[PDB]
Design a protein around this nucleic acid. Structure first.
Ligand SMILES: [Ca+2]
Ligand SMILES: [Ca+2]
Ligand SMILES: [Ca+2]
Ligand code: NA
Ligand code: NA
Lengths: 257, 256
DNA sequence: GCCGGTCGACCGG
DNA sequence: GCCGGTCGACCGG
């Protein structure tokens, strides 16, 4: 990680940073701590200025550093990596229409919140804000499906030393007429036991876990991670197939016969 | 519907309205046109003050005119309807610790945005916002599961005349800073063909469609709508179990 | 004390 | 038309 070494510099400037609350008055979903994510990034941009990039920010530069390139085919080859492309790309149309006049904007679908790149190594940073004023179910981490594919693309293309997926939990609470961070948590996806990783199918097939509680004792290799997770996914997919019928079918069959 | 009769009147007030954008970043999800639901409730309050209630505002009122009744037990009996309870009631410890000094607030998973009650009849209205500046996918209408549960309850209790679930789509487009409502659409769930409803399992098993495109020509009994929906629900469920395997199993089995 | 359901609203490598 | 993932972050009728 490119943040791990300065987690204390970050964690510190965070706790106690009174930030105005959303003018909307819902504090749910994106609006929840959206301003917080911005807060985190802004710091990196000033500390690790050379490695910090917003996912679209990276893209716009990537394309702009190669102006003599056009079309989707050519612009995709600029990733020099299938996996890393499947995680950061935009889509035929969006890619083909890119321009210095029609840049890329933040897309709700984007895999990573912030990108940290250096020495041909990428760190996909996804921050999760958590309202400490209450106790709720584990946040959405990432799509198990998009994770299963990323593993396939890793195994097939043999790319085990290219990127990392790390999370930064930002605990906040309501105080007065504005929000306030009260603590933080960091963890590395590829450092946790894959087999134990929880997949919430209904919840957009997302993996769910509080960063604060994520274990980090995986001693195996990266290749060993992918292959191990992909096995966990399938198993859970099968198990879910059955349970789905046992829960959304059986108890209702007495209304159609 | 207590809204329909004056749809044209609401549709005229909303068009033109504006809402300042948040942190000036990704106006999506709970942070998108969300604020427009606050304008629907407002105008609805001004023209139907005796029937407009935030689902929580309503519950706080119910309990407030029943000082004698305390405890989750009896407090639930205050709904006088299982189904509606499954759709409006709050948690156990929540209804227990309720006091005029600890009222209900906005819950993130509350079935409705607005509740229009009148003469023992309810209208669970769910407002939908949308940036028409782009051809986007259809929004989450409601949990297909929660719906199947609702119908099943409607048949166990014969409650085929008590509530209606309707939707109000409000389209907006960015204009400098604030977002300005440019259009509107209204539609009644229980009028659409319960069999042509699209269940997106990966998307919180939510029913998905754009209000402006929902068909309104069902010509059966409410009892029929339910029976049908459960037949359509149970079917799709089986089909999903099979689709999963061929999409999250076979293409990944080469890896072990 | 183990687990997963719901709301909001997004385009198509 | 039609089909369907994905990011965000929420507690118990
Ligand atoms: Ca995030
Ligand atoms: Ca709504
Ligand atoms: Ca299309
Ligand atoms: Na994520
Ligand atoms: Na809904």
């Amino acid at each position: 990680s490119f943040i791990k070494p300065i987690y204390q510099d970050i964690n510190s400037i965070l706790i106690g940073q009174k930030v105005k609350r959303p003018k909307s008055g819902t504090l749910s979903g994106h609006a929840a701590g959206e301003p917080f994510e911005k807060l985190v990034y802004k710091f990196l941009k000033e500390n690790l200025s050379d490695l910090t990039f917003k996912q679209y920010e990276y893209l716009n530069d990537l394309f702009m550093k190669n102006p003599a390139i056009i079309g989707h085919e050519a612009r995709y080859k600029l990733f020099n990596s299938p996996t890393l492309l499947f995680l950061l790309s935009r889509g035929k149309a969006a890619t083909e229409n890119w321009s210095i006049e029609n840049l890329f904007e933040e897309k709700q679908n984007d895999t990573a919140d912030i990108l940290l790149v250096k020495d041909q190594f990428y760190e996909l940073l996804d921050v999760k804000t958590r309202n400490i004023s209450k106790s709720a179910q584990a946040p959405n981490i990432i799509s198990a499906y998009k994770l299963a594919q990323t593993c396939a693309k890793m195994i097939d293309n043999k790319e085990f030393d290219l990127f990392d997926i790390n999370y930064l939990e930002v605990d906040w609470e309501l105080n007065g007429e504005d929000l306030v961070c009260v603590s933080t948590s960091f963890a590395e996806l590829f450092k946790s036991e894959p087999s134990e990783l929880y997949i919430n199918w209904a919840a957009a097939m997302q993996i769910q876990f509080h960063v604060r509680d994520l274990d980090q004792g995986f001693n195996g290799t990266r290749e060993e991670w992918a292959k191990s997770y992909l096995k966990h996914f399938v198993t859970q997919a099968e198990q879910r197939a059955i349970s789905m019928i046992d829960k959304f079918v059986k108890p209702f069959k007495k209304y159609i016969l």
